[PDB]
Design a protein around this ligand. Structure first.
Ligand SMILES: */C(=C/C(=O)N(C)C)CNCCOc1ccc(Oc2c(-c3ccc(O)cc3)sc3cc(O)ccc23)cc1
Ligand SMILES: */C(=C/C(=O)N(C)C)CNCCOc1ccc(Oc2c(-c3ccc(O)cc3)sc3cc(O)ccc23)cc1
Lengths: 224, 217
């Protein structure tokens, strides 16, 4: 994994992308039926996210305890960044699934969600204005998984992280940006990870306030 | 502006000169009440934080409403990064003030703090094993201010990015090492944002600014 070239790192991440799932086909929504649809969608996406995580270069080198801890810390950030990527070409709307395209006005169905919704819409628009590319997106998504959670494991994680930084830079140079523009865009992209982490923390708090484990799914699949 | 015309060295020099002082916890030897000391220290530090923010290049160009909003979102993040900077050379301890240096054991007195306490220590040791430099620290603190929560904001952030790269180049880092270190520092920013969100949560569970921000700004 540390032996990969930038081009191999990009290609591995693109081939590892999870599928776009559909919402259940179950009518103005109520708080219970909207959260029921989103929970059921999140639960099904989580299985594919575990398969994706196992293919992120360096992830399966970790102990099985750390693989679980990283997924436990990152899963909502990863769901959210997938959501904001999918929503880029739908201004004013969040594409939870191709059959579950919601505007902020539907977010009010759930008490405490419309504000986290607005952050997601704002982040989506920022990705649009930055012209975020899919190859950059898979790098950021990978960074989120490795960064969100043995001193040797930490060290190993950092080397993969450095490799992904090199890959991001390599992509920007290969696209013809100047070195100044390369370092600037790299910063702009990483600073958005701060916003995604914040939205995840607000989301986790919102979810804890509602009646509802991931731990069992992680362990079953990770060991599998 | 003049802020957008600054060189990397002027940006560093301005930020170094705007650094607030390290305040001390009040001395009441016969006075748990650990939170009282931390709140009083935090309140006095905020006053200097507002004065510092006004000297971050490009900050006073914003409207008063945005200046207020950035400080309201960033203040605990700024407090925390100052804390981890001060604690770098005290492994296992958080130097809230020179006379209030606590270890984990002392942190466990406050219910709800020990989780965030361990995260603060981990960030400090990480800053310690990257040998974070004081000029890098002031740039990171500025980024936190501007990134907290406009095109002008984006341009100053580009300038601080350029300044950070300049510092690493002048320190002899290779270009590959320059972009790697730049990524490492900014990724630590998301942990600081994380620690701040948990801290607001912890603080909100204990009963105990907008008007102070408006008065000073
Ligand atoms: C059971 C317990 C529980 O939540 N805790 C904390 C113990 C519920 N199972 C956890 C997963 O539940 C969900 C339900 C709904 C979503 O929606 C969702 C996003 C989101 C969540 C919360 C707020 O306030 C705003 C947005 S983002 C996103 C992206 C995606 O691809 C699919 C769903 C989704 C997540 C998890
Ligand atoms: C009223 C309401 C309210 O908002 N709160 C938060 C009580 C008054 N607000 C005044 C701000 O209050 C404080 C009190 C104590 C600290 O301690 C502190 C840090 C910290 C706090 C909580 C957790 O869970 C972890 C760490 S970090 C840090 C750094 C520093 O230089 C000075 C104090 C300090 C902060 C704000």
């Amino acid at each position: 994994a540390l032996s990969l070239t930038a081009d191999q790192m990009v290609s591995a991440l693109l081939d590892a992308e999870p599928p776009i799932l559909y919402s259940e086909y179950d009518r103005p929504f109520s708080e219970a039926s909207m959260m029921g649809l989103l929970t059921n969608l999140a639960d099904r996406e989580l299985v594919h996210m575990i398969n994706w995580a196992k293919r992120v270069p360096g992830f399966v080198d970790l102990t099985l305890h750390d693989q679980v801890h990283l997924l436990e810390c990152a899963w909502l950030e990863i769901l959210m960044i997938g959501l904001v990527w999918r929503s880029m070409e739908h201004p004013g709307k969040l594409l939870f699934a191709p059959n579950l395209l919601l505007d902020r006005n539907q977010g009010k169905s759930v008490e405490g969600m419309v504000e986290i919704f607005d952050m997601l819409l704002a982040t989506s628009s920022r990705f649009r204005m930055m012209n975020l590319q899919g190859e950059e997106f898979v790098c950021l998504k990978s960074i989120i998984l490795l960064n969100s959670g043995s001193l040797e494991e930490k060290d190993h994680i950092h080397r993969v992280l450095d490799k992904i930084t090199d890959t991001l830079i390599h992509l920007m140079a290969k696209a013809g940006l100047t070195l100044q523009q390369q370092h600037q865009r790299l910063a702009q992209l990483l600073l958005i990870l701060s916003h995604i982490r914040h939205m995840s923390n607000k989301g986790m708090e919102h979810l804890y306030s509602m009646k509802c484990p991931l731990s069992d799914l992680l362990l079953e699949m990770l060991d599998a």
